[PDB]
Amino acid sequence: MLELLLLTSELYPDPVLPALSLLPHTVRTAPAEASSLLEAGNADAVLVDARNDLSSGRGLCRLLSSTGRSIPVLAVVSEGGLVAVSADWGLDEILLLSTGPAEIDARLRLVVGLGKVSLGELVIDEGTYTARLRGRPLDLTYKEFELLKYLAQHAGRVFTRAQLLHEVWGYDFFGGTRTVDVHVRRLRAKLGPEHEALIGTVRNVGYKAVRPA
DNA sequence: CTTCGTCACGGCGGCGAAACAACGAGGGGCTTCCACCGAAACCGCGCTGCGTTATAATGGGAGCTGTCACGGATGCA
Numbered sequence: 001m002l003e004l005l006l007l008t009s010e011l012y013p014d015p016v017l018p019a020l021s022l023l024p025h026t027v028r029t030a031p032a033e034a035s036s037l038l039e040a041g042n043a044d045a046v047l048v049d050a051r052n053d054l055s056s057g058r059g060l061c062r063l064l065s066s067t068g069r070s071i072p073v074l075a076v077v078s079e080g081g082l083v084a085v086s087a088d089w090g091l092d093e094i095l096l097l098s099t100g101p102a103e104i105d106a107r108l109r110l111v112v113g114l115g116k117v118s119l120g121e122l123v124i125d126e127g128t129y130t131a132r133l134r135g136r137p138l139d140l141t142y143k144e145f146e147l148l149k150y151l152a153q154h155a156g157r158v159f160t161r162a163q164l165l166h167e168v169w170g171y172d173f174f175g176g177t178r179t180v181d182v183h184v185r186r187l188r189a190k191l192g193p194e195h196e197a198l199i200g201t202v203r204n205v206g207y208k209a210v211r212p213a
Numbered sequence: 214c215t216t217c218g219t220c221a222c223g224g225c226g227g228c229g230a231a232a233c234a235a236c237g238a239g240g241g242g243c244t245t246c247c248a249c250c251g252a253a254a255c256c257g258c259g260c261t262g263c264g265t266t267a268t269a270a271t272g273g274g275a276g277c278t279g280t281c282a283c284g285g286a287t288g289c290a
Contacts (some may be wrong), residue, residue: 141218179220203228 001025002108005040007032007060008049016049017076022101025108032056034063040071044112048075051097054084065090072111120211121195124149133191140190143168147183151199151209160206180207 002025008016013027020027030036032049040046046064050057057075064073072092077085085094093111095104116124123132129145131138140148147168150159161180165171169179184207188196200208 143219174220177220178222182220 002044002112003028003042004108005030005036005043005046006049007036007046010049016051017047017095017097017099017104019099019101020104023105032060034060037064043071045108046071046073047095048073050075050077051081052078054081058084058089061089061091074107074111120152120155120198122148122152122198124152133195135192138190143179144183144187144190147180148187151207155209155211158200158206158208164207 004020004025004027006013006016006027006029008029009031010016011029013020013029028039028043030039037046048057048060050061054077057077061073061075064070073090074093074095075085075089075091076095076097079096079098082094082096085091093107095107099107121134122138125131129142130140131145131148147164150164150168161177162173164180165173165177184199184201188199191198197210197212200210202208
């Protein structure tokens with residue numbers, strides 16, 4: 001009753017997951033391509049092969065992730081390869097290549113079968129990449145909107161420039177930037193006289209966010 | 214083509230940490246025994262030396278000896 005779409009170059013679903021033939025779910029196969037995500041129709045779940053290669057499997061799990069709406073993404077890895085399997089893959093469920101038929105059935109029937117938190121005086125709207133600080137208008141540049149976003153949810157957490165750099169930027173990451181200094185100085189300006197006490201900037205500890213009061 | 218985002222550039226400055234000098238409690242400087250080294254001793258005894266042996270016994274075993282020549286030093290006649 002589920003259409004499972006395999007992105008695997010094995011040309012058969014059998015060595016990727018052996019016991020799946022014991023369940024009468026339909027399996028539609030294609031090589032591990034992003035364009036075969038356009039090959040998804042009424043697929044209820046999707047399995048990626050990452051048994052020997054954790055990197056492209058994790059990135060494909062990432063390629064699916066955050067796109068929306070979304071159909072939940074699954075992957076199959078090895079047991080010594082479960083070290084890299086984490087929440088950073090964008091997984092909803094991970095499968096091993098030795099999980100049983102009723103086990104895969106239960107994981108599938110679990111996974112295929114609200115608003116933002118208010119409020120730290122900085123609302124986050126995901127549409128135009130902008131916020132709202134005690135006032136409707138709040139212009140945030142491409143990276144001056146996520147810098148506040150990064151310090152928003154991790155309020156109270158201490159983050160160094162590089163720790164911020166690789167999540168706030170791509171990052172590349174360049175050096176000798178002061179881009180944090182350029183931003184936080186700018187992010188402490190468009191926030192008006194009030195809420196200047198939203199970021200904790202003590203010397204050489206990085207740039208932590210201080211939540212009220 | 215237009216207009217916005219980013220990323221150094223350079224300084225500013227206020228924190229900040231490390232160097233330098235008022236010194237007092239763990240070492241340096243005290244006795245106080247006796248298992249001990251170490252002495253001093255008290256030995257005996259392998260180890261070397263030295264003595265004696267009482268029928269008669271009364272002359273080496275051995276060695277295999279040659280060159281080639283030559284000056285000369287040495288016993289004869």
